[PDB]
Amino acid sequence: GVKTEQEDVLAKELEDVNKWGLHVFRIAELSGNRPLTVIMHTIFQERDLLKTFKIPVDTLITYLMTLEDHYHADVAYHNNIHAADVVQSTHVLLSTPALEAVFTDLEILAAIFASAIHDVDHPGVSNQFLINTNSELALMYNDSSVLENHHLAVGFKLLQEENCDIFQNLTKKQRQSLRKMVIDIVLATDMSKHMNLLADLKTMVETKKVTSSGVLLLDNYSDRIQVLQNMVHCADLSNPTKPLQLYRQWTDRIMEEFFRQGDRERERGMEISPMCDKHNASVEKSQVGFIDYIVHPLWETWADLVHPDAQDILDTLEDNREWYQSTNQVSEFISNTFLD
Numbered sequence: 001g002v003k004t005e006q007e008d009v010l011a012k013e014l015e016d017v018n019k020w021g022l023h024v025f026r027i028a029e030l031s032g033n034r035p036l037t038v039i040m041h042t043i044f045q046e047r048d049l050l051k052t053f054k055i056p057v058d059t060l061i062t063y064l065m066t067l068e069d070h071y072h073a074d075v076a077y078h079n080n081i082h083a084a085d086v087v088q089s090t091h092v093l094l095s096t097p098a099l100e101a102v103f104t105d106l107e108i109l110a111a112i113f114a115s116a117i118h119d120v121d122h123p124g125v126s127n128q129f130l131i132n133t134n135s136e137l138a139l140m141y142n143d144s145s146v147l148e149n150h151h152l153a154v155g156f157k158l159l160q161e162e163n164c165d166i167f168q169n170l171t172k173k174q175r176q177s178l179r180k181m182v183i184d185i186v187l188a189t190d191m192s193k194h195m196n197l198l199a200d201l202k203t204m205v206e207t208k209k210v211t212s213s214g215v216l217l218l219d220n221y222s223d224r225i226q227v228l229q230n231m232v233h234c235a236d237l238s239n240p241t242k243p244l245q246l247y248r249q250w251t252d253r254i255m256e257e258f259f260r261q262g263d264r265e266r267e268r269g270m271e272i273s274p275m276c277d278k279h280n281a282s283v284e285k286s287q288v289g290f291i292d293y294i295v296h297p298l299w300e301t302w303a304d305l306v307h308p309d310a311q312d313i314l315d316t317l318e319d320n321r322e323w324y325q326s327t328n329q330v331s332e333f334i335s336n337t338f339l340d
Protein backbone atom coordinates (compact mmCIF):
# COMPACT_ATOMS: atom_id res chain seq x y z
CA GLY A 1 0.00 0.00 0.00
CA VAL A 2 2.79 2.43 -0.94
CA LYS A 3 2.40 4.75 -3.92
CA THR A 4 4.80 5.10 -6.86
CA GLU A 5 6.63 8.35 -7.55
CA GLN A 6 4.17 9.08 -10.37
CA GLU A 7 1.18 8.32 -8.13
CA ASP A 8 2.72 10.67 -5.52
CA VAL A 9 3.42 13.52 -7.95
CA LEU A 10 -0.19 13.08 -9.08
CA ALA A 11 -1.37 13.04 -5.43
CA LYS A 12 0.33 16.41 -4.78
CA GLU A 13 -1.26 18.02 -7.84
CA LEU A 14 -4.67 16.79 -6.61
CA GLU A 15 -4.16 18.87 -3.45
CA ASP A 16 -5.24 21.79 -5.70
CA VAL A 17 -8.64 20.09 -6.32
CA ASN A 18 -10.58 22.88 -4.52
CA LYS A 19 -8.69 25.66 -6.38
CA TRP A 20 -9.66 27.58 -9.54
CA GLY A 21 -6.61 27.10 -11.78
CA LEU A 22 -5.99 23.42 -11.11
CA HIS A 23 -3.28 22.21 -13.49
CA VAL A 24 -5.85 19.96 -15.20
CA PHE A 25 -3.72 19.07 -18.24
CA ARG A 26 -0.85 17.78 -16.10
CA ILE A 27 -3.27 15.63 -14.10
CA ALA A 28 -4.20 14.16 -17.50
CA GLU A 29 -0.54 13.33 -18.16
CA LEU A 30 0.23 12.04 -14.65
CA SER A 31 -2.80 9.69 -14.49
CA GLY A 32 -2.16 8.06 -17.90
CA ASN A 33 -4.94 10.05 -19.55
CA ARG A 34 -7.42 9.46 -16.72
CA PRO A 35 -8.16 13.01 -15.50
CA LEU A 36 -11.96 12.39 -15.24
CA THR A 37 -11.57 9.24 -13.13
CA VAL A 38 -9.04 10.51 -10.57
CA ILE A 39 -10.72 13.94 -10.22
CA MET A 40 -14.19 12.37 -9.88
CA HIS A 41 -12.80 9.88 -7.36
CA THR A 42 -11.03 12.57 -5.31
CA ILE A 43 -14.16 14.75 -5.27
CA PHE A 44 -16.43 11.87 -4.17
CA GLN A 45 -14.20 10.97 -1.18
CA GLU A 46 -13.72 14.65 -0.31
CA ARG A 47 -17.53 15.08 -0.21
CA ASP A 48 -18.11 11.64 1.35
CA LEU A 49 -20.46 10.61 -1.49
CA LEU A 50 -19.47 6.93 -1.31
CA LYS A 51 -20.77 6.53 2.28
CA THR A 52 -23.90 8.68 1.84
CA PHE A 53 -25.04 6.79 -1.27
CA LYS A 54 -23.52 3.42 -0.36
CA ILE A 55 -21.62 3.24 -3.63
CA PRO A 56 -19.10 0.38 -3.79
CA VAL A 57 -15.64 1.78 -4.60
CA ASP A 58 -14.85 -0.89 -7.21
CA THR A 59 -18.16 -0.17 -8.98
CA LEU A 60 -17.45 3.58 -8.90
CA ILE A 61 -13.95 3.17 -10.42
CA THR A 62 -15.32 0.82 -13.12
CA TYR A 63 -18.04 3.33 -14.07
CA LEU A 64 -15.73 6.35 -14.19
CA MET A 65 -13.25 4.50 -16.42
CA THR A 66 -16.07 3.29 -18.71
CA LEU A 67 -17.53 6.80 -18.97
CA GLU A 68 -14.11 8.32 -19.61
CA ASP A 69 -13.41 5.64 -22.27
CA HIS A 70 -16.46 6.90 -24.23
CA TYR A 71 -14.99 10.40 -24.41
CA HIS A 72 -13.11 10.59 -27.72
CA ALA A 73 -9.33 10.58 -27.36
CA ASP A 74 -9.02 11.93 -30.96
CA VAL A 75 -11.18 15.05 -30.36
CA ALA A 76 -9.07 18.07 -29.35
CA TYR A 77 -11.51 19.94 -27.09
CA HIS A 78 -14.63 17.92 -26.18
CA ASN A 79 -12.72 15.10 -24.51
CA ASN A 80 -12.16 13.61 -21.03
CA ILE A 81 -9.95 16.58 -20.01
CA HIS A 82 -12.75 19.06 -20.76
CA ALA A 83 -15.09 16.72 -18.89
CA ALA A 84 -12.76 16.62 -15.85
CA ASP A 85 -12.40 20.41 -16.01
CA VAL A 86 -16.14 21.13 -15.97
CA VAL A 87 -16.57 18.64 -13.09
CA GLN A 88 -13.80 20.22 -11.03
CA SER A 89 -14.94 23.77 -11.81
CA THR A 90 -18.48 22.89 -10.70
CA HIS A 91 -17.01 21.34 -7.56
CA VAL A 92 -15.32 24.67 -6.77
CA LEU A 93 -18.48 26.69 -7.55
CA LEU A 94 -20.42 24.30 -5.25
CA SER A 95 -18.02 25.11 -2.39
CA THR A 96 -18.58 28.89 -2.49
CA PRO A 97 -19.42 30.57 0.90
CA ALA A 98 -22.73 32.05 -0.31
CA LEU A 99 -23.97 28.49 -1.05
CA GLU A 100 -22.86 26.92 2.24
CA ALA A 101 -25.32 24.22 3.36
CA VAL A 102 -27.89 25.27 0.72
CA PHE A 103 -27.89 22.12 -1.46
CA THR A 104 -28.69 18.51 -0.49
CA ASP A 105 -26.26 15.64 -1.14
CA LEU A 106 -28.56 14.33 -3.90
CA GLU A 107 -28.49 17.77 -5.57
CA ILE A 108 -24.70 17.90 -5.19
CA LEU A 109 -24.49 14.40 -6.69
CA ALA A 110 -26.65 15.56 -9.62
CA ALA A 111 -24.54 18.64 -10.39
CA ILE A 112 -21.23 16.74 -10.20
CA PHE A 113 -22.45 13.62 -12.08
CA ALA A 114 -24.12 15.76 -14.75
CA SER A 115 -20.87 17.69 -15.31
CA ALA A 116 -19.11 14.32 -15.78
CA ILE A 117 -21.45 12.92 -18.49
CA HIS A 118 -22.30 16.26 -20.13
CA ASP A 119 -20.21 15.86 -23.32
CA VAL A 120 -19.65 12.06 -23.40
CA ASP A 121 -19.34 10.64 -26.95
CA HIS A 122 -18.95 14.10 -28.55
CA PRO A 123 -17.83 13.66 -32.19
CA GLY A 124 -16.20 17.14 -32.30
CA VAL A 125 -18.80 18.59 -34.68
CA SER A 126 -21.84 20.76 -33.91
CA ASN A 127 -25.56 20.01 -33.66
CA GLN A 128 -26.31 22.03 -36.79
CA PHE A 129 -23.51 20.17 -38.61
CA LEU A 130 -25.06 16.82 -37.63
CA ILE A 131 -28.51 18.05 -38.74
CA ASN A 132 -27.42 19.39 -42.17
CA THR A 133 -25.29 16.28 -42.87
CA ASN A 134 -28.30 14.08 -41.98
CA SER A 135 -26.52 12.05 -39.29
CA GLU A 136 -28.15 9.20 -37.35
CA LEU A 137 -27.91 11.23 -34.10
CA ALA A 138 -29.93 14.05 -35.69
CA LEU A 139 -32.62 11.66 -36.96
CA MET A 140 -32.59 9.75 -33.66
CA TYR A 141 -33.42 12.93 -31.65
CA ASN A 142 -35.55 14.79 -34.21
CA ASP A 143 -33.07 17.68 -34.58
CA SER A 144 -33.62 18.77 -30.93
CA SER A 145 -30.60 19.35 -28.66
CA VAL A 146 -29.13 16.46 -30.60
CA LEU A 147 -25.74 16.09 -28.94
CA GLU A 148 -27.07 16.98 -25.50
CA ASN A 149 -29.76 14.29 -25.61
CA HIS A 150 -27.06 11.84 -26.79
CA HIS A 151 -24.66 12.75 -23.95
CA LEU A 152 -27.39 12.03 -21.37
CA ALA A 153 -28.45 8.79 -23.02
CA VAL A 154 -24.90 7.37 -23.19
CA GLY A 155 -24.12 8.58 -19.67
CA PHE A 156 -27.13 6.77 -18.21
CA LYS A 157 -26.85 3.76 -20.51
CA LEU A 158 -23.28 3.01 -19.30
CA LEU A 159 -24.67 2.40 -15.79
CA GLN A 160 -25.79 -1.00 -17.14
CA GLU A 161 -22.32 -2.32 -18.11
CA GLU A 162 -20.67 -4.93 -15.87
CA ASN A 163 -20.29 -3.59 -12.32
CA CYS A 164 -21.07 0.01 -13.35
CA ASP A 165 -24.37 0.81 -11.59
CA ILE A 166 -23.07 3.40 -9.11
CA PHE A 167 -26.70 4.12 -8.06
CA GLN A 168 -27.58 0.48 -7.37
CA ASN A 169 -28.33 1.18 -3.66
CA LEU A 170 -30.40 4.39 -3.95
CA THR A 171 -34.19 4.14 -3.51
CA LYS A 172 -36.47 4.66 -6.52
CA LYS A 173 -37.45 8.02 -4.96
CA GLN A 174 -33.78 9.14 -5.02
CA ARG A 175 -33.07 7.71 -8.48
CA GLN A 176 -36.05 9.46 -10.09
CA SER A 177 -35.09 12.74 -8.41
CA LEU A 178 -31.44 12.41 -9.41
CA ARG A 179 -32.37 11.50 -12.99
CA LYS A 180 -34.70 14.47 -13.52
CA MET A 181 -32.14 16.91 -12.07
CA VAL A 182 -29.36 15.42 -14.21
CA ILE A 183 -31.51 15.71 -17.34
CA ASP A 184 -32.54 19.29 -16.58
CA ILE A 185 -28.87 20.24 -16.05
CA VAL A 186 -27.36 18.58 -19.14
CA LEU A 187 -30.13 19.77 -21.47
CA ALA A 188 -29.46 23.33 -20.28
CA THR A 189 -25.86 23.04 -21.58
CA ASP A 190 -27.25 23.35 -25.11
CA MET A 191 -25.49 26.62 -25.99
CA SER A 192 -28.63 27.94 -27.77
CA LYS A 193 -30.35 28.09 -24.35
CA HIS A 194 -27.75 30.63 -23.09
CA MET A 195 -29.86 33.82 -23.25
CA ASN A 196 -32.82 32.02 -21.69
CA LEU A 197 -30.46 30.75 -18.98
CA LEU A 198 -28.97 34.24 -18.50
CA ALA A 199 -32.45 35.84 -18.34
CA ASP A 200 -33.53 33.53 -15.51
CA LEU A 201 -30.29 34.16 -13.61
CA LYS A 202 -30.77 37.94 -13.93
CA THR A 203 -34.33 37.61 -12.57
CA MET A 204 -32.97 35.54 -9.66
CA VAL A 205 -30.46 38.33 -8.88
CA GLU A 206 -32.90 41.25 -9.21
CA THR A 207 -35.19 39.46 -6.72
CA LYS A 208 -32.53 37.79 -4.53
CA LYS A 209 -33.21 36.98 -0.88
CA VAL A 210 -30.81 35.81 1.84
CA THR A 211 -30.95 33.76 5.06
CA SER A 212 -29.10 34.35 8.37
CA SER A 213 -25.48 35.41 7.76
CA GLY A 214 -24.89 35.60 4.03
CA VAL A 215 -26.32 32.34 2.67
CA LEU A 216 -28.59 32.25 -0.42
CA LEU A 217 -32.25 31.17 -0.06
CA LEU A 218 -33.87 28.85 -2.61
CA ASP A 219 -37.46 27.98 -1.67
CA ASN A 220 -38.74 25.83 -4.59
CA TYR A 221 -37.47 23.26 -7.11
CA SER A 222 -37.48 25.77 -9.97
CA ASP A 223 -35.14 28.25 -8.26
CA ARG A 224 -32.96 25.40 -6.94
CA ILE A 225 -32.54 23.75 -10.35
CA GLN A 226 -31.99 27.08 -12.19
CA VAL A 227 -28.97 27.86 -10.01
CA LEU A 228 -27.52 24.37 -10.68
CA GLN A 229 -28.23 24.73 -14.40
CA ASN A 230 -26.36 28.05 -14.47
CA MET A 231 -23.60 26.70 -12.21
CA VAL A 232 -22.65 23.90 -14.61
CA HIS A 233 -23.14 26.25 -17.59
CA CYS A 234 -20.72 28.69 -15.94
CA ALA A 235 -18.32 25.73 -15.55
CA ASP A 236 -18.84 24.89 -19.25
CA LEU A 237 -17.95 28.50 -20.19
CA SER A 238 -15.15 28.88 -17.60
CA ASN A 239 -11.98 28.66 -19.76
CA PRO A 240 -11.61 32.44 -20.09
CA THR A 241 -11.82 32.89 -16.29
CA LYS A 242 -8.86 30.57 -15.64
CA PRO A 243 -5.16 31.53 -15.56
CA LEU A 244 -3.92 32.41 -19.06
CA GLN A 245 -1.69 29.38 -19.76
CA LEU A 246 -4.79 27.21 -19.17
CA TYR A 247 -7.10 29.54 -21.12
CA ARG A 248 -4.66 29.61 -24.06
CA GLN A 249 -4.60 25.79 -24.27
CA TRP A 250 -8.40 25.56 -24.41
CA THR A 251 -8.51 28.24 -27.15
CA ASP A 252 -5.97 26.26 -29.21
CA ARG A 253 -7.99 23.07 -28.71
CA ILE A 254 -11.43 24.53 -29.51
CA MET A 255 -10.09 26.26 -32.65
CA GLU A 256 -8.49 23.03 -33.90
CA GLU A 257 -11.84 21.31 -33.47
CA PHE A 258 -13.65 24.22 -35.21
CA PHE A 259 -11.23 24.30 -38.17
CA ARG A 260 -11.45 20.51 -38.48
CA GLN A 261 -15.23 20.91 -38.87
CA GLY A 262 -14.69 23.73 -41.35
CA ASP A 263 -12.34 21.48 -43.33
CA ARG A 264 -15.10 18.85 -43.54
CA GLU A 265 -17.71 21.42 -44.63
CA ARG A 266 -15.41 22.76 -47.38
CA GLU A 267 -14.60 19.21 -48.60
CA ARG A 268 -18.36 18.64 -48.96
CA GLY A 269 -18.97 21.96 -50.74
CA MET A 270 -21.01 23.35 -47.84
CA GLU A 271 -21.19 26.90 -46.51
CA ILE A 272 -18.37 27.01 -43.92
CA SER A 273 -19.62 27.67 -40.39
CA PRO A 274 -18.69 30.94 -38.63
CA MET A 275 -15.21 30.75 -37.03
CA CYS A 276 -14.43 27.45 -38.81
CA ASP A 277 -12.61 28.91 -41.83
CA LYS A 278 -8.89 28.49 -41.10
CA HIS A 279 -7.95 30.77 -44.03
CA ASN A 280 -10.28 33.55 -42.80
CA ALA A 281 -10.40 33.79 -38.99
CA SER A 282 -9.39 35.97 -36.05
CA VAL A 283 -8.94 33.95 -32.86
CA GLU A 284 -8.02 37.15 -31.02
CA LYS A 285 -11.03 39.26 -32.13
CA SER A 286 -13.30 36.25 -31.42
CA GLN A 287 -12.27 35.74 -27.81
CA VAL A 288 -12.65 39.44 -27.01
CA GLY A 289 -16.14 39.21 -28.58
CA PHE A 290 -16.74 35.96 -26.71
CA ILE A 291 -15.95 37.62 -23.37
CA ASP A 292 -17.68 40.99 -23.99
CA TYR A 293 -20.93 39.57 -25.36
CA ILE A 294 -21.34 36.16 -23.61
CA VAL A 295 -18.77 35.14 -20.99
CA HIS A 296 -18.52 38.40 -18.99
CA PRO A 297 -22.31 39.02 -18.84
CA LEU A 298 -22.80 35.49 -17.47
CA TRP A 299 -20.03 35.58 -14.86
CA GLU A 300 -20.91 39.12 -13.75
CA THR A 301 -24.47 37.92 -13.00
CA TRP A 302 -23.07 34.87 -11.19
CA ALA A 303 -20.71 37.19 -9.26
CA ASP A 304 -23.74 39.32 -8.28
CA LEU A 305 -25.69 36.23 -7.14
CA VAL A 306 -22.83 35.05 -4.90
CA HIS A 307 -21.22 38.45 -4.06
CA PRO A 308 -18.32 38.78 -3.24
CA ASP A 309 -16.90 35.23 -3.58
CA ALA A 310 -16.30 35.38 -7.38
CA GLN A 311 -14.36 38.67 -7.65
CA ASP A 312 -10.95 37.00 -8.16
CA ILE A 313 -12.43 34.79 -10.89
CA LEU A 314 -14.02 37.87 -12.52
CA ASP A 315 -10.77 39.86 -12.21
CA THR A 316 -8.94 37.08 -14.04
CA LEU A 317 -11.59 37.20 -16.78
CA GLU A 318 -11.13 40.98 -17.21
CA ASP A 319 -7.32 40.63 -17.23
CA ASN A 320 -7.34 37.84 -19.86
CA ARG A 321 -9.74 39.93 -21.96
CA GLU A 322 -7.34 42.89 -21.93
CA TRP A 323 -4.51 40.52 -22.90
CA TYR A 324 -6.35 39.20 -25.98
CA GLN A 325 -7.51 42.74 -26.91
CA SER A 326 -3.85 43.84 -26.99
CA THR A 327 -3.06 41.14 -29.61
CA ASN A 328 -18.70 40.06 -38.48
CA GLN A 329 -17.88 36.34 -38.41
CA VAL A 330 -17.55 36.79 -34.65
CA SER A 331 -21.04 38.35 -34.63
CA GLU A 332 -22.45 35.52 -36.75
CA PHE A 333 -20.89 32.88 -34.47
CA ILE A 334 -22.54 34.43 -31.41
CA SER A 335 -25.97 34.79 -33.06
CA ASN A 336 -26.04 31.28 -34.49
CA THR A 337 -24.66 29.63 -31.31
CA PHE A 338 -26.09 31.40 -28.23
CA LEU A 339 -29.53 32.47 -29.56
CA ASP A 340 -32.46 30.05 -29.75
Ligand SMILES: COc1ccc(Cc2ccc(NC(N)=O)cc2)c(F)c1-c1cccc([N+](=O)[O-])c1
Pocket residue numbers: 125126127191237239240250251254275286287289290291294330333334337
Ligand atom coordinates in the same frame (compact mmCIF):
# COMPACT_ATOMS: atom_id res chain seq x y z
C1 LIG B 1 -12.06 29.62 -25.86
O1 LIG B 1 -13.06 29.61 -26.87
C2 LIG B 1 -14.31 29.06 -26.66
C3 LIG B 1 -14.58 28.20 -25.59
C4 LIG B 1 -15.85 27.64 -25.37
C5 LIG B 1 -16.93 27.90 -26.21
C6 LIG B 1 -18.29 27.27 -25.93
C7 LIG B 1 -18.76 26.49 -27.14
C8 LIG B 1 -18.28 25.21 -27.34
C9 LIG B 1 -18.69 24.49 -28.46
C10 LIG B 1 -19.59 25.01 -29.39
N1 LIG B 1 -19.88 24.18 -30.44
C11 LIG B 1 -20.54 24.41 -31.60
N2 LIG B 1 -21.22 25.51 -31.96
O2 LIG B 1 -20.48 23.51 -32.42
C12 LIG B 1 -20.06 26.31 -29.18
C13 LIG B 1 -19.65 27.04 -28.06
C14 LIG B 1 -16.74 28.79 -27.38
F1 LIG B 1 -17.74 29.08 -28.23
C15 LIG B 1 -15.40 29.39 -27.60
C16 LIG B 1 -15.25 30.27 -28.79
C17 LIG B 1 -14.33 29.98 -29.78
C18 LIG B 1 -14.23 30.81 -30.89
C19 LIG B 1 -15.07 31.92 -31.02
C20 LIG B 1 -16.01 32.21 -30.03
N3 LIG B 1 -16.85 33.33 -30.13
O3 LIG B 1 -16.84 34.04 -31.13
O4 LIG B 1 -17.73 33.65 -29.09
C21 LIG B 1 -16.09 31.38 -28.91
Ligand SMILES: [Mg+2]
Pocket residue numbers: 118119189190
Ligand atom coordinates in the same frame (compact mmCIF):
# COMPACT_ATOMS: atom_id res chain seq x y z
MG1 LIG C 1 -22.13 20.58 -24.93
Ligand SMILES: [Zn+2]
Pocket residue numbers: 082086118119236
Ligand atom coordinates in the same frame (compact mmCIF):
# COMPACT_ATOMS: atom_id res chain seq x y z
ZN1 LIG D 1 -18.81 21.10 -22.31
